[PDB]
Amino acid sequence: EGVFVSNGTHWFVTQRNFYEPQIITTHNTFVSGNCDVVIGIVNNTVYDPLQPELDS
Amino acid sequence: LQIPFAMQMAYRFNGIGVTQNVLYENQKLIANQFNSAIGKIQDSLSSTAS
């Protein structure tokens, strides 16, 4: 839920009706298939909070 | 508040309980079905007054 947003250096996800920028994560997002199908898709990291929990 | 039309349509899909990726994956089919469906209005109203 919400929308992806940037101001020219970072990508964040916000709810639609009030600016509330969050880090883009596997909790904030769902997958569907490969890059090649979507028009206007962009390259950015998606964070996974499990990986530091496995590292710690 | 401006928004790209393909993203407005993904929200209008997400409003009827169809997941956003169904639009972005089928965007060419949806655009062609829409453009064709408006052509039938133009031809219907051109063809008869009734």
Ligand SMILES: *[C@@H]1O[C@H](CO)[C@@H](O)[C@H](O)[C@H]1NC(C)=O
């Ligand atoms: C926007 O630009 C500033 C400076 O680079 C940066 O601190 C901020 O995190 C960026 N935010 C977004 C949404 O791009």
Ligand SMILES: *[C@@H]1O[C@H](CO)[C@@H](O)[C@H](O)[C@H]1NC(C)=O
């Ligand atoms: C958006 O518009 C620019 C021209 O201003 C064009 O080069 C680009 O390919 C377009 N991208 C999409 C996702 O339509």
Ligand SMILES: *[C@@H]1O[C@H](CO)[C@@H](O)[C@H](O)[C@H]1NC(C)=O
């Ligand atoms: C996105 O990343 C892939 C792999 O690094 C690269 O081939 C592709 O050209 C990139 N596309 C854009 C729009 O940066």
